[PDB]
Symmetry: C2
Subunit: 243 residues, 2 copies
C-alpha cells in the first residue's frame, strides 16, 4: 500500500497465525501461513501443523455451506431451486480456489522441500485430502480424473508410511482415517474401506506399548474415529488436529 517495507518477519507471521487461531479467524491464519510457506523455507512441525489446521478450517466452512445449500437445492418442488443452484456454484468456486491455492503450495513448496519421509507422508496426505474435496464438487467428466489424482496421492503416502513409520504415529493414523473415508465416500468400496480401517486400527492396537505420552491424545482420538467408523460401516473435532 503505503507502508515502508516493515513487512512481518516469519516469526511474527507465525505469532499472528496463532493469535488468528485463538480468535477464530482462520482466513487470517491461512494467509499468515501461506506467506511463511512462500518464503521457501521448509516449515517446522509447528508451522506445518499450523498451516494444515488453518486450511482445514477454511475449506471446512465452505464444505459445510456447500452441503447445506446443495441439500436445500434438492428439497425443492421451482424458481427458488436455481436461486440455490447458483449460490452453490459460487460456493463451489470459493472451494476450488482454496483447494487450488493449497494444492499449489504443496507442489511449489511443501512436497519438494520434504526432508524426512514423515513430512513427505504428511504433505501427500494433505494433497489427497484437497484433491478429494475438489472431487466431491467436481463435474461429471472431470470427477473421474480428479478422484484418482486424489487416490494416487493417498496411495504414495500410504506406501511410504508403511515402509517408514510406526502404526501408532498420528500421521499414519490420520492418513488411514481419511483414506478409508476416501474408499468409502468417494469410491463406494465399503469393503476396501473397512479393510484399511481395521488393519490400521489393529496394527496400532498391537503396539500401544510404543505410543508415546506426547502423541497419545492425538493418536488415540484418531484410533477412536477409525473404530467408531467400523461399527457404522458394519451394523468433527478433527479440525483442531493437523493429522
Amino acid at each position: 500500500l503505503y507502508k515502508k517495507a516493515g513487512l512481518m518477519d516469519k516469526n511474527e507471521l507465525v505469532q499472528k497465525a496463532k493469535l488468528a487461531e485463538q480468535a477464530e479467524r482462520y482466513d487470517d491464519m491461512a494467509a499468515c501461513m501461506k506467506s511463511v510457506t512462500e518464503q521457501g523455507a521448509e516449515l517446522s512441525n509447528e508451522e506445518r501443523n499450523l498451516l494444515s489446521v488453518a486450511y482445514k478450517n477454511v475449506v471446512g466452512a465452505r464444505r459445510s455451506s456447500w452441503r447445506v445449500v446443495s441439500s436445500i437445492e434438492q428439497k425443492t418442488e421451482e424458481k427458488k431451486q436455481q436461486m440455490a443452484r447458483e449460490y452453490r456454484e459460487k460456493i463451489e468456486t470459493e472451494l476450488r480456489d482454496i483447494c487450488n491455492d493449497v494444492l499449489s503450495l504443496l507442489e511449489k513448496f511443501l512436497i519438494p522441500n520434504a526432508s524426512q519421509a514423515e513430512s513427505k507422508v504428511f504433505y501427500l496426505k494433505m494433497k489427497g485430502d484437497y484433491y478429494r474435496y475438489l472431487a466431491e464438487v467436481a463435474a461429471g467428466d472431470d470427477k473421474k480424473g480428479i478422484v484418482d489424482q486424489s487416490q494416487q496421492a493417498y496411495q504414495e503416502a500410504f506406501e511410504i508410511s508403511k515402509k517408514e513409520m510406526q502404526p501408532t504415529h498420528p500421521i499414519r493414523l490420520g492418513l488411514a482415517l481419511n483414506f478409508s473415508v476416501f474408499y468409502y465416500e468417494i469410491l463406494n468400496s465399503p469393503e476396501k474401506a473397512c479393510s484399511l480401517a481395521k488393519t490400521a486400527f489393529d496394527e496400532a492396537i498391537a503396539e500401544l506399548d510404543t505410543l508415546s505420552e506426547e502423541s497419545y491424545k492425538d493418536s488415540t482420538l484418531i484410533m477412536q474415529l477409525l473404530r467408531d467408523n467400523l461399527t457404522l460401516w458394519t451394523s468433527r473435532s478433527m479440525e483442531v488436529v493437523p493429522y
Copy 2:
C-alpha cells in the same frame, strides 16, 4: 466484477438468498443481501427486518468475540508479542467500526425515517443504541463521550416510545430493557440504574402474565435473561448470543 450487466437481483431474489446464506452460516453474504434490500428505499417487512438484524448481529458479533479474545491475550502478557496482539486488536477494531457504521448508516438514511408504526421506530432505535454501544465498547478517550451519548439518546427515545405505546411483555419492549440495562452497567458504569432498570422491566412483565399467547416463549426468554443479568450484577461473565 465490472464484467456484469445490470441484470442483477431484485428484492425478492435478494431476500430469498439472504435466507439461504443464513442456512449456510455466511452472515457476510446475508448482510450484503439485506443491506441491498434496505437500500432500495422501501420500508422493510417484518420478515425482512429480522433477516437484517440477524445478519448484522452475527457479522458484528463475530468481530466482537475476536476482539475480546485478542484483547485478553494483550493483557495476559505483562512482551514484544504484546505489540502484535495490540496491532491485531486494532485491525479488528477497524473491521468493527466499519460494520457498525454502515449499519448505523442504514438506520439514519432509511430504517428510522421509513418507520411508520411506533413498534418499528422502537426496534430500529434500539438497534441504533445497540451499534453505538458496540462502537462505545472499543472507542478511545476523545471520541468516546459522544459515542456513548449517541448510544444513550437512542436507547432513551426508544425507551419512552416503548413504555408509552407497548405492553410490558412485548418482547421488543422487553428486549429493549435488556440492552438498555447492559448499556448502563457495562458502558456507563451505572450499576444501580442497570439493576433497577432490569428489575423493573421484569416486574411489570411479571404483573401482566395475562398477555400471551405463543409472542410468548419470546417474552419469557427475555424475561429469563433480565433475571440472569440481575442475578449476575447483584451476586458475587455475562453471555453473548
